[PDB]
């Protein structure tokens, strides 16, 4: 009966501050290919896209 988040989601990053938000590793590109190099590698803080992150939310709601 209890739904329970795209557990998956909760798992793959997918984090919330009960304030009303979430984030995933900047994940812009990184930790994958990258015969890239430096400065580019400057993107690993965290990030969050609004609008959309609702589904995410309620799917989750209950734990993570």
């Amino acid at each position: 009966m209890p739904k329970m988040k795209t557990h998956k989601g909760a798992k793959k990053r997918v984090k919330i501050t009960a304030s009303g938000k979430v984030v995933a590793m900047k994940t812009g590109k990184r930790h994958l290919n990258w015969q890239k190099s430096g400065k580019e590698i400057r993107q690993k803080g965290r990030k969050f896209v609004l609008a959309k992150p609702e589904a995410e939310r309620i799917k989750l709601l209950l734990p993570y």
Partner: protein, 49 residues
């Protein structure tokens, strides 16, 4: 695989920094420079295959 192969720099056992590079013209010749997070800057060296 082409005269373009990827290497990267490491420094006197006290770190390693990265970046790709090539193969063509002077091939192997690979000292270079760069600076690790070792100490404050430091040679580094480069090479590392």
């Amino acid at each position: 695989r082409i005269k373009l192969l990827l290497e990267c720099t490491e420094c006197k056992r006290r770190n390693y920094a990265t970046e790709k590079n090539k193969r063509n013209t002077p091939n192997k010749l690979e000292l270079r420079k760069y600076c690790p997070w070792c100490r404050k800057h430091t040679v580094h060296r480069e090479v590392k295959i």
